[PDB]
Structures are given as C-alpha cells and as structure tokens.
Curated annotation (Swiss-Prot), chain B:
It comes from Schizosaccharomyces pombe (strain 972 / ATCC 24843). It is found in: Nucleus; Nucleus, Nucleolus; Nucleus, Nucleoplasm. It comes from the Eukaryota. The chain holds residues 1542 to 2407 of 4717 of the full protein. Belongs to the midasin family. Nuclear chaperone required for maturation and nuclear export of pre-60S ribosome subunits. Functions at successive maturation steps to remove ribosomal factors at critical transition points, first driving the exit of early pre-60S particles from the nucleolus and then driving late pre-60S particles from the nucleus. ATP binds at residues 25-32, 294-301. Residues 276-496 are annotated as: AAA-ATPase protomer 6. This is Midasin. The gene is mdn1. The lineage of its organism: Eukaryota, Fungi, Dikarya, Ascomycota, Taphrinomycotina.
Length: 354, 741
C-alpha cells in the first residue's frame, strides 16, 4: 500500500515486496512504474508524448491535490529530500519499520528479502559486497581467496542458485542462447527462470553488454527481449581489468586465519599439527621458491586437511607425502620428503618406498 | 573542368585499346572522374560494381546479375575496390579481362557485350601482379583558383570574397597543419570546403563546425589564431543555450524539429555537454554523417540518446566492433514475433491520436505483447472485428492473411530496416570492425542503397532516408576510423568539463533537484523557475531590472502566475505587464525583424546575447532596449520616490503646502521629466539612454545629497547640457530655482 511512499527511498527491497504482491493506483502507478523497461498500457499519458497531451494531461492527487502532469517537479524534489535524509546504520531499521503492514526479511550486512562461513577479512569482503548486491548492479571481484566460494556462500545466504558458467575463448552463443535448426539456451534459461560467470578476462562481450545494459537479451531468432524480473544479478570473476565491464560492472576488490578455519572446520584437528602442516605448505612454497607447475593454496591446504581428516579416523607422513606427488623429479619428491620430515618426526624412508 | 578534361583526355586515350582501365591516382578523389564522363559518352551505362569482401563469383556470373548484365549489355562497368576482393573473384575478373569468353560451369559451359569496356577503381594501395598487368592503368591534383571555379556552382548565397576566404582558409589550414605538432592524419579536404560553402547558404557557424574537430585545446587555440590570420576576426566562442520548447528544442544558431516520441529515456540534459550537443544537432539537421567521435566514458551514447530522445527519432544501435560483415548490416516464429511487435507499435500510434479504443482489443494488445503460434490466428480474429481501423488493418490484416501460411514451407537487414523505416541508427563502438564494412556504408553515405537481397537484375535502392541518420560513435582506445569515413563525415569530439549546475544535476541522486529535470517543457519551466528564483542569494534598481530582463516572456507570465525583493517584484510584474515593452517590443519586432529571427518570443537576454556579431556592428538595436528597461525601472523608482515627496527636502516638499521652497519644484519637475522619459515615439527612438540614466543616478544622488543647491543645480544643468521636452522641464525647474538663486 502506501509504503511505496518510501518506494525508491531505500533500495528495491520495497520493490521486491511489491513483486510478492502489488497492484496499481493513480499516483502509485504514476510512481513505481517508471522503471527502465516495461510497457505501460494503464496510464500511457506518461510515455504517449511530451506535447500538450503529456504536457497538459493531468495528475491525480499529487500531494493529495490534483495538479497536471508536471507534478513530477512536485515530486522530483520531494523524493530528493528523502534521498538526502537517508544519508543519516539504522537505515535498515527504518526500512523494517517501514514494512509495518512479516515476509522473509533477511538481515545480513544490511538487509535483504529473497557452508562457507567466516568472521574474518571475509566479513569485510561481505561488507564490501553487501552494497552493490543490494543495489543490483553487475558486480565483479579482482588468487586463491575463495572468491568463487565467497559468491557461492553469498548466494547460499540468498535463496539463489549460482549457475556458474565458465565462459571461455571458444564459446559459441549456445549456452548463451542456443542454436535452432527453438533453442533452450543456458544463459537465456537463467535469464528466463543469481548467475555467475568466470574466465571472463581471456560477440560474447556484445552479449554481456546486452544483458549488462538492461535486464534483457538479444534473442535474434525467437525475436523477444526477456524481462528478467527476478534476481538476475550476473556476477562475474577475474583478477585484471581489461573488459567493457570495467566500464559496465561495479568492480570491487588474510590467509593465515585459515589456521583457525580448519580448526573451526575439522573439530578433531584441534591440534596445531594442522598449523604445522600449514607451515609444511609454507616450506613446500620455499622449496618451490625443478619447475613449479603448481601453487600451494588455501584450497590446497584445505584438501590436505581433507586427506588428513580421512587419515584421522585411525603416522601421517605418507599423507603429505601424497601432497607433493605432483613433482616430476623423484629427487624433488625426496626433497619434499626431507622438508616434510623436518616438519614431522624422525626419518621413515621405509614409508618413502613402500 | 580544365584539368579534369585533361584526365578525361587520358581516359579517352586509354579506351583506344581493349583492356580494363585502371585509375592509378592519388587518394581523395573517388571515381567521379569516370562517374561523370559516361554522361558525356554516347549513352554508356554506369555499372558501378562495388566489389567487396562478401562477393562470390556466383554473385558475378549467377544464372544457376549486374556483372552478368554488363557482360550481356555493353556498359561502363565501374569495378569499385578491387583490392578488397576474395582472390578467386579476383581470378574471375582476370578471366573476364582475357579475350576468351567466360566458360561457366554452373548452368552452361560458357557465354558468347560488343564493347563492354570495364573500368577499374585502383583503390588506396595489394592487387595481384597478373591482374594489375593485364589491365591498363590511367594516372590522375586540384587547384585553388580551380577550387574557386568549383565553388562557383555554390556562390549564389555566398559573399564571393568570403567564399575566396573560406577556400584560402581551408587550403592554408591544411598546409600549415601538415608541418607541425598539431593527433590524427588531419585530412582537411575540398569536400569540407564545399560543405562549408553549402552550409553558408542557410542563414561563425563555419568556424564552429570546422574547428570543433580539433581535439587538443592547444591546437584549437592555434587554429583560432590561424582563423585570425586569414579571416581577420576574433573567434570568441558564441555561447549556446538550451531553449527547449514544445514544438522545437534549440541551441545556439541551431533548431530541431522536436515532433510520436519513442525512446522515453533516463539520462538528463547534461548542461556542460551543451557546447557540443548543439554541434551535432546542427549535424542532425544538415543531413551530414553524424560522428560522435572521441574518447571513452566521456558520455557519447548519452549525447545521441538525449538528442534523438528529445527529438523522438527512435534510436536503435548496432555494436559494429564484433568483426561483423557487410551482409550483417545489409523461422516462422521470427516473423510471428516481428508481427506481434509491429502490431503493438501500430496500435500504439493508433491510440495516440484517436484515443477511443478499448472489447478484447485491449486483450488483443496484451496478446500482442505476449512454433506454436496458433493464438496469432486469434489475433487475426481481432483484426477481423472504421476508417482508422481500416488504416491499421491495412498493414495488419495483410500481414495476418500472410500469417495464415503459418503451416507451410519455409526458406530460412540491420540498417535496411532503419533506412526504410524512420528510426535513427546508432553504429555504436564502431572503431574496429572492418575497413570494407564502413566502405559499403560510405557507398550509402553519399541517397540510393544498392542491396543484393533483391531478385534478379534490379538494384531497388531505398530512397526513404528522410529521418534516417547514420550516427557513429567511436573511441580512441581502439584504432581510429579509417581516413575514407573520416574524410566523408562530420567529426565531432567530446571531452569532460563538469560545470556547477551540470555536476549538480548529473550526480543529483543524492541532492534534491536538477536544473533541467525533464524532457517535457512544462516541467522544465517550473524546475528552472524554482531554481533561479532560489539562486538569488539604491540597490534593487539594477537587480529588478536585470532579473526582469533575463527571465523569458513566457517565464514572465509564469512569474506573475506564481504570485524580500522578489515580493516587491510582483509590483514590477504588474507594472511590466502594464509597460515592460509596449512599443519597445515594436522596435524589437521591427528591429528584430530586419535581421534573421526566430518565429516567436522565447528568449530575451539570449536574444541580447544572440545577435553578438550584429550588435558588434555598432547598431545596438538589442542593447538599447536593455538599457531602456533599466530606464523604465529606475524611472518607476524615482517616480514613486517623488510621489512620496508629494529633511530640508522634506521642508521644501512640505512647503508645497523654513519657507519659500525652491528644492521641491526643482525635484518634482525633473521627476516629471523622468516619468515623461519613461512612457512617446521618440522615447522609443531615444546610447543616449545611458546619458539620461546618468541624470537618473544624479537625481538619486541629489535626493540623497539633499547650501549646496547652487552647485547641485549646476550639476543638473551639466546633465542637461549633456529633443525638447525632457530637458525643457529641467530648464523650467532650474530657472525657477535660479530665480530663487
């Protein structure tokens, strides 16, 4: 109802509550229907023309008084004073106050209404990405911080399923839209029914601009742009800046806390033998730095924690001995073994050739 | 011409031997030197074979036909852009040059053109040394007095010495720009000279749209210096202004037919872009090739977006940088969806004018915005069930009766939609697509379009170009547009300024107000009137004068309608609608009428600023009206002060009823002379108004400076010593005060 009063005051939380269930009125459909793409057909006085048709039509009850048409100037300062007042936090408290006529009001960093947890630099990252994900511009993120996992668990905080297309430099427009001879399409399916793309940095750019410019696509064969009227936030990932999304998408930017994290994750790995294996990963990095065709990561240390967890039902020198098996010189395998036995106890070379 | 006749004499010498004639000439010309000679050649048809990339040999022998008809009927076959060929079509051309007749595979073995000489556009060099040694090559520069001779076809509405000045200016401009730092190739060709000459015939503008296209501001300063060196003037920039009325939106010696509005946009006026938004609007009116060139993220799509948004010219864009092809510019359900969309468009334009329709016709409209397309047949039922309905069903029932074939056999352009409709096309981001794609575009740049999706032997060029403007964005990040399309367009850079109200309105999503906050004039009026009547933060004379001098006459009526100093301005509003410009507007109309002038009364101080060369002619027709307004307002102040006159001056004015006054008459008669000078034909015919205002300040300064009566009277006598009645009243009051003195 009248909470569209504060319609564009806060972000589209109120527009989402409308998308649950809402109808028009005179000044209501005057107000909220001005979005970036529709077809009006209820009051097309607003878009019919700007001559004395639109320059002289009417407007019903603008401050509950009936001016004519240009009460936009009555309103495009009245809403701007509210947009100034909302620079003064408890803004979401005001939005929840404003919802006073009990839906799935999600909190978060600020608010919403739609595994991978942390209370760390990841909390500041979720702080840095609550804003634009509320504002629904296309976002990005710019190795090994779990940024794909960050977006994945962010979508898990939502009610959204991140179809994660790893677009590549050989991609056709198929999983974009599909080829017919009627094409089902994949990106068109997610536009139809949260989306994520990766390897965007290395045609496809034009398709991104069509999705990016406005929530609609160039379906060339079927001939219909798609009103993407849900939560179609087409988040991406690459660590560079060279694309049109550098103009188009609102770009956005502590590993040793992983020590606590697996301590959080694996309960019976509460020993810092875990952190000793993190130091073993550091020593593996120092041995790499015959040719380092691999990079020890927090994903890699998490997988080492996984194989150690598989062990710990039952020592584990063989475990990290597997964790450097990608080493094309057996001398280098022996050096990894020496580094490990330095991190471990005394020399079991018996295990080294079992 | 003369030299053109020498080149044509060379081509005549060339035709005396049976081979292909190649034009081995320096660039810039084009094949006009053979496009024209055919008219002076024995009825020889001009087969302008624009040989390009997407051009198969099957597009040159067919039969499984322009080159085929030229092999059949004898003609001049102008083969454009041989260097851009696919090297089996090149082989086919070599075979055609050979004496042996074509030995087709595809229908028959070979064809038996008594004298079909084929001329060859040896383009900017590539060609194979066998194709370029079986032909015959003909050599091809213009001259300055010869350029005046070519200008003589344009010197009807041209000051002829100013024509020689424009020609010498372009020549020495290129000759001086090709010797220093200023970056681009900087073409500056004779097509631009003829463009400026034919721009002159539709009355500063020449300098504006021939040196807005120097991007580095230092080079712009040097170009203005060269303009002073040649044209002998000072290139002070004529300030433009956004007059945005209903039937026309206009900026600075450029209007626009702002007629039916499609876009319904969401970007604002961007007032700092007003210095270049005009320079394309003129380019939108002269039907020149719009090139919103320049640099990235500065705002270029918003310029053309706002321009054809206010104009309503149905912007539609194609991002030609995807290595797109010439065929990309020029299956049941696709036609069904296009039918639904066009049905919606025609129903929209229907409900625009005769707003009476509803009935499942509104359900037909909802269906129109909604293969298994059998429901479209239901649409035709709605097309089944007046004369406006007849005009809609003319397209609709025809396309739907064709759509009855939606159970039949199938057989499954970009710009050719807009070139045949009335939309405005935006080749966006179009720096790096192809040279030849823009070459086939520039074939249509100078209109008739030769397609190949037609049937057999006929070109069928679509001449609907009225409201069809090639607006090409660019950026500097990729490679620049090629020198051909640079040499055949209106280059217009853009930059970044961020002025005060500009940055206030662009980033206004926090603040409360823009300045020009719509694309509808009845809103923009109340917007700017809410701004400048809030931007206001012996005084109020020049204030009230300039304030009631800058606001528009429609805005003057509006300020009266909206009824410290602004409160007293309502008295000035009543007194102005009494006597702001009673016959002063008659001088302005007649004074305004002799010079080229608008159709109505929209701008005043911009009109005062607008004849900026004319009032630099010393006529001062517009300026004297401005001072006359100050005379009237100051006069009203002096007269109300004198009605208040109806401490020593208080004593004299009382002694109308110390004793024996001399000051009161000395004031009251001169103030009567003032109000006489306010309201009368020679009062309109009165720079001397400044001298009268000197006395107006003088009567002010004496009513403040009210012993010294002798000297003050001698001063009033000097401003009289500075027409009969207006000093005659000072003569009476002064001789009376000197009878007292």
């Amino acid at each position: 109802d009248v909470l569209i009063e504060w319609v564009a005051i806060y972000p589209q939380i109120y527009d989402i509550l409308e998308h649950i269930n809402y109808v028009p009125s005179n000044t209501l459909q005057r107000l909220r229907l001005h979005q970036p793409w529709s077809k009006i057909d209820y009051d097309v006085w607003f878009l019919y023309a700007s001559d004395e048709i639109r320059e002289t039509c009417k407007v019903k009850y603008y401050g509950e008084t009936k001016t004519y048409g240009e009460v936009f100037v009555l309103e495009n300062e009245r809403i701007s004073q509210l947009h100034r007042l909302f620079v003064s936090e408890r803004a979401e408290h005001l939005k929840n106050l404003l919802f006073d006529a009990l839906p799935l009001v999600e909190l978060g960093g600020n608010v919403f209404f739609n595994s991978l947890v942390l209370t760390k630099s990841t909390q500041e990252n979720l702080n840095r990405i609550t804003p634009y994900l509320v504002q629904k511009r296309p976002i990005l993120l710019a190795e090994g911080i779990g940024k794909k996992f960050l977006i994945t668990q962010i979508a898990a905080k939502l009610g959204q399923q991140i179809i994660r297309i790893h677009l590549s430099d050989s991609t056709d427009p198929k999983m974009l839209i599909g080829t017919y001879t009627w094409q089902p399409g994949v990106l068109t399916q997610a536009v139809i029914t949260w989306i994520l793309f990766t390897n965007i940095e290395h045609e496809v750019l034009s398709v991104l601009l069509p999705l990016l410019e406005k929530r609609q696509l160039v379906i060339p064969s079927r001939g219909e742009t798609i009103y993407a009227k849900g939560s179609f936030q087409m988040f991406a990932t690459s660590s560079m800046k060279t694309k049109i999304l550098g103009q188009r998408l609102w770009q956005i930017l502590y590993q040793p806390d992983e020590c606590v994290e697996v301590v959080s994750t694996l309960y019976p790995v509460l020993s810092i033998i875990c952190p000793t294996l993190y130091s073993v990963y550091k020593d593996i990095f120092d041995l790499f730095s015959s040719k380092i065709y691999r990079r020890l990561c927090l994903r890699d240390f998490y997988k080492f924690i996984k194989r150690v967890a598989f062990l710990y039902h039952k020592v584990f020198k063989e475990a990290i001995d597997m964790f450097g098996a990608f080493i094309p010189s057996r001398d280098g395998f022996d050096l990894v073994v020496r580094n490990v036995a330095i991190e471990l106890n005394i020399p079991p070379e018996k295990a080294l050739q079992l | 011409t003369d030299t053109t006749l020498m080149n044509a004499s060379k081509v005549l010498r060339a035709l005396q031997v049976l081979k292909p004639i190649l034009l081995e000439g320096s660039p810039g010309v084009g094949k006009t030197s053979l496009i024209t000679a055919l008219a002076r050649e024995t009825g020889h048809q001009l087969v302008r074979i624009n040989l390009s990339d997407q051009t198969d040999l099957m597009d040159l022998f067919g039969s499984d036909a322009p080159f085929l008809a030229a092999m059949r009927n004898g003609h001049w076959v102008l083969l454009d852009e041989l260097n851009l060929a696919s090297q089996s079509v090149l082989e086919g051309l070599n075979a055609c040059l050979d004496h042996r007749n074509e030995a087709y595979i595809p229908e028959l073995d070979k064809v038996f053109h008594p004298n079909f000489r084929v001329f060859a556009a040896q383009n900017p060099q590539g060609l194979p040394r066998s194709f370029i040694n079986r032909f015959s090559v003909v050599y091809v520069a213009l001259k300055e007095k010869d350029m005046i001779e070519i200008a003589a076809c344009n010197y009807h509405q041209v000051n002829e010495d100013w024509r020689l000045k424009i020609i010498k200016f372009m020549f020495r401009l290129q000759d001086n720009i090709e010797k220093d730092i200023s970056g681009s190739p900087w073409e500056f060709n004779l097509r631009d000279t003829l463009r400026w000459l034919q721009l002159l015939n539709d009355a500063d503008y020449l300098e504006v749209m021939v040196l807005h296209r120097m991007r580095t501001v230092e080079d712009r300063v040097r170009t203005c210096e060269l303009f002073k060196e040649v044209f002998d003037i000072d290139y002070e920039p004529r300030t433009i202004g956004f007059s945005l009325s209903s039937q026309c939106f206009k900026v600075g010696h450029s209007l626009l037919v702002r007629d039916q509005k499609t876009l319904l946009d969401s970007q604002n006026i961007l007032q700092s872009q007003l210095p270049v938004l005009e320079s394309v609007i003129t380019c939108i009116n002269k039907k020149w090739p719009c090139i919103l060139v320049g640099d990235t993220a500065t705002g270029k799509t918003c310029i053309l977006r706002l321009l054809a948004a206010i104009a309503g010219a149905k912007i539609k864009e194609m991002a030609v940088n995807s290595d797109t092809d010439t065929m990309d510019l020029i299956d049941i359900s696709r036609k069904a969806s296009e039918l639904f969309t066009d049905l919606s468009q025609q129903l929209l334009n229907i409900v625009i004018k005769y707003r009476n329709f509803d009935i499942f016709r509104e359900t037909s409209l909802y269906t129109l915005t909604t293969s298994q397309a059998f429901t479209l047949l239901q649409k035709v039922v709605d097309q089944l069930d007046e004369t406006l309905v007849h005009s809609l069903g003319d397209i609709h029932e025809k396309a739907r009766k064709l759509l009855a074939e939606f159970s039949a056999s199938p057989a499954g352009g970009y710009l050719l939609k807009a070139v045949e409709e009335g939309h405005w096309f935006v080749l966006d981001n179009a720096n790096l697509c192809s040279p030849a794609v823009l070459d086939r575009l520039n074939s249509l740049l100078e209109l008739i379009v030769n397609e190949k999706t037609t049937e057999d032997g006929h070109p069928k060029t679509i001449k609907p170009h009225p409201n069809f403007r090639l607006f090409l964005t660019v950026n500097p990040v990729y490679g620049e547009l090629s020198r051909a399309m640079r040499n055949r367009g209106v280059e217009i850079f853009l930059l970044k300024e961020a002025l005060t109200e500009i940055d206030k309105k662009q980033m206004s999503l926090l603040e409360p107000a823009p300045i020009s906050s719509a694309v509808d004039t009845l809103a923009s009026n109340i917007s700017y009137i809410k701004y400048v009547f809030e931007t206001m933060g012996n005084y109020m004379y020049i204030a009230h004068a300039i304030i009631l001098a800058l606001f528009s006459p429609r805005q003057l009526k509006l300020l009266r309608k909206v009824l410290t100093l602004k409160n007293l301005v309502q008295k000035i509003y009543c007194a102005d609608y009494f006597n702001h410009m009673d016959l002063k507007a008659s001088r302005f109309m007649d004074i305004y009428e002799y010079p080229v002038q608008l159709r109505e009364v929209v701008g005043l101080i911009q009109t005062i600023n607008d004849f900026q060369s004319v009032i630099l002619t010393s006529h001062l027709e517009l300026p004297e009206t401005y001072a006359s307004g100050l005379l009237f307002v100051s006069a009203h102040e002096i007269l109300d002060l004198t009605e208040e006159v109806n401490t020593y001056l208080l004593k004299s004015a009382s002694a109308v009823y110390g004793s024996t006054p001399s000051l009161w008459n000395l004031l009251n008669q001169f103030s009567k002379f003032l109000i006489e000078i306010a309201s009368s034909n020679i009062v309109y015919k009165l720079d001397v108004i400044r001298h009268f205002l000197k006395l107006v300040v003088l009567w002010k300064n004496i009513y403040v400076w009210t012993s010294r009566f002798y000297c003050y009277t001698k001063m009033l006598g000097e401003w009289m010593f500075t027409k009969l009645l207006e000093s005659f009243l000072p003569k009476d009051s002064l001789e009376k005060f000197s009878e007292l003195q």
